[PDB]
Amino acid sequence: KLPPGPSPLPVLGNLLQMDRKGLLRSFLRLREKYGDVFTVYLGSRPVVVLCGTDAIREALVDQAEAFSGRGKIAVVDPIFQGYGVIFANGERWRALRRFSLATMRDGKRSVEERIQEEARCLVEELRKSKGALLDNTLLFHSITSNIICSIVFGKRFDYKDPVFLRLLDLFFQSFSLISSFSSQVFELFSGFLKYFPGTHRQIYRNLQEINTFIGQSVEKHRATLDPSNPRDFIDVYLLRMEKDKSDPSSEFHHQNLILTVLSLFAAGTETTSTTLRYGFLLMLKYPHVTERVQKEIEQVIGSHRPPALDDRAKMPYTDAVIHEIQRLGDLIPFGVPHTVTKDTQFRGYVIPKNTEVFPVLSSALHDPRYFETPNTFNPGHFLDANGALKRNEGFMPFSLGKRICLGEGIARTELFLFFTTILQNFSIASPVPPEDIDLTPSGVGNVPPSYQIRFLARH
Numbered sequence: 001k002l003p004p005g006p007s008p009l010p011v012l013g014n015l016l017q018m019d020r021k022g023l024l025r026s027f028l029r030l031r032e033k034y035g036d037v038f039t040v041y042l043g044s045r046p047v048v049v050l051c052g053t054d055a056i057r058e059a060l061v062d063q064a065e066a067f068s069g070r071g072k073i074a075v076v077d078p079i080f081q082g083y084g085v086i087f088a089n090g091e092r093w094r095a096l097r098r099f100s101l102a103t104m105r106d107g108k109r110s111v112e113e114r115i116q117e118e119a120r121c122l123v124e125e126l127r128k129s130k131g132a133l134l135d136n137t138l139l140f141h142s143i144t145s146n147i148i149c150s151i152v153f154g155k156r157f158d159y160k161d162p163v164f165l166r167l168l169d170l171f172f173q174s175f176s177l178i179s180s181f182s183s184q185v186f187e188l189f190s191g192f193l194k195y196f197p198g199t200h201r202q203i204y205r206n207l208q209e210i211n212t213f214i215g216q217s218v219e220k221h222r223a224t225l226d227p228s229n230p231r232d233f234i235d236v237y238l239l240r241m242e243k244d245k246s247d248p249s250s251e252f253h254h255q256n257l258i259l260t261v262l263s264l265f266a267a268g269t270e271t272t273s274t275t276l277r278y279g280f281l282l283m284l285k286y287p288h289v290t291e292r293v294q295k296e297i298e299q300v301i302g303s304h305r306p307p308a309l310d311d312r313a314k315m316p317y318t319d320a321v322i323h324e325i326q327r328l329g330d331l332i333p334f335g336v337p338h339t340v341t342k343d344t345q346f347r348g349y350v351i352p353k354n355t356e357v358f359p360v361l362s363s364a365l366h367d368p369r370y371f372e373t374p375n376t377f378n379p380g381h382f383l384d385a386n387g388a389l390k391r392n393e394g395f396m397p398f399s400l401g402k403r404i405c406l407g408e409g410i411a412r413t414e415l416f417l418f419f420t421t422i423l424q425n426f427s428i429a430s431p432v433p434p435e436d437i438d439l440t441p442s443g444v445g446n447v448p449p450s451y452q453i454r455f456l457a458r459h
């Protein structure tokens, strides 16, 4: 009645059949024996696992709603308690997404321009290093955050700013701890381990502190608010609160505002950052690729005017590189968890309503049916015989269906504009030779090795 599962022990679950190397590696080892769709016991609760493009499409697109439910991540659930855009369910999630999607769609300068602007800052910043060795971590987390900040707070912060950097520091320290092997162990046995000291308490304090600053910004916004002339996501949300003053059954209250703003930073910054970081890592290893991208820039955009999003349709090779950067990136390898909305019928099995489903986004991105060389950087994977962009059914790095990444538009806009703007202005080099670069990296999120890079100016 459930997908073929290994014989679990009570309380402990399928522990003894896991691999020590991490969940993901645990899931892929099982897939070998138990097929494309199986069941594993993470403690006392079971979860359906989906491997391969088809299984994920069959569930998330074809049974879109059935698989529209959100699961908890034990290490952050104390913070979120099922409020906010990412971790809400039912009406709470629907109303909020409907609100979020529409609102981002709008300093009165469109999302494109704010990203173009942010890119100019980065270009001005990178010149100052005047060719020095640098670890692009801090810069990349900083630019992506400014976009979210510009959407929700209605401003951006300088890179040298001390206070910005500290909240930022502890924000990304939280993720690194969420992706830790310790957070994965916590997922299995949280019910026992929440009374012990562990990384979960550090994650709890780091985030609660971020929320404090968010709250303060809400108040300051509320005190300065001009209803006739809104400025950002919060200003808007505030006016929808006043609108719904009469209704207690409404979802638009304080607690949802806070965890939503937290949610936007949680999703909007970390993955977008690591992609650029992985991208340049890859671009250091393959000079022949970057030369081509720079050549494609020289022909279409030139060495003068900055890149616009319009330019992408005319730049199929760069776009394909970015596609392949995201493919190999594999930054969310088994995805944000899902749950079923009703007792669902799937491939002849019965997934009882409320059963967690792990759509393994890694297996899709390395699917040999869709990608000739699944373990090699191959921009060809996305280029037809005429050298034009071709989409692929295995390319689902933003997942699929009703839960599809809400910021896909914004994310891709950032990748393209950031890559083309940096590379238009700087050639790249590093202490490590291309042949000696190793890419293999962690848990819920992938995090590739930290590296050092020179951003050499061009003129």
Ligand code: HEM
Residues within 6 Å of the ligand: 070, 085, 086, 087, 097, 148, 263, 264, 267, 268, 269, 271, 272, 275, 331, 332, 335, 336, 359, 361, 397, 398, 399, 400, 403, 404, 405, 406, 407, 408, 410, 411, 412
């Ligand atoms: C290129 C970088 C990004 C990648 C690779 C990425 C990927 C993903 C993935 C895999 C999910 C899980 C969807 C699911 O299975 O439920 C997700 C969810 C989400 N993403 Fe992103 N994302 C990126 C950037 C962004 C940005 C920039 C934003 C907004 C500023 C954003 C907003 C969201 C939200 C709100 C969710 C939760 C959706 C829901 O449960 O309703 N993401 N993203």
Ligand SMILES: OC[C@H]1O[C@H](O[C@H]2[C@H](O)[C@@H](O)[C@H](OCCCCCC3CCCCC3)O[C@@H]2CO)[C@H](O)[C@@H](O)[C@@H]1O
Residues within 6 Å of the ligand: 145, 149, 157, 163, 164, 167, 168, 171, 210, 213, 217, 265
């Ligand atoms: O000492 C007071 C002065 O600083 C204020 O700037 C603020 C800012 O307005 C207030 O925005 C700030 O909070 C800012 C930090 C940005 C964190 C945003 C995200 C970063 C990464 C992801 C997590 C959160 O604290 C600073 C206060 O030190 C004031 O606005 C100034 O006018 C002033 O003279």
Ligand SMILES: COC(=O)[C@H](c1ccccc1Cl)N1CCc2sccc2C1
Residues within 6 Å of the ligand: 073, 076, 086, 171, 174, 175, 178, 265, 266, 267, 268, 270, 271, 332, 335, 336, 444, 445
């Ligand atoms: C849609 O989900 C997220 O955006 C991620 C996410 C969840 C699970 C695995 C990978 C990722 Cl990137 N959040 C989860 C909670 C927090 S707190 C500070 C940052 C994040 C990142």
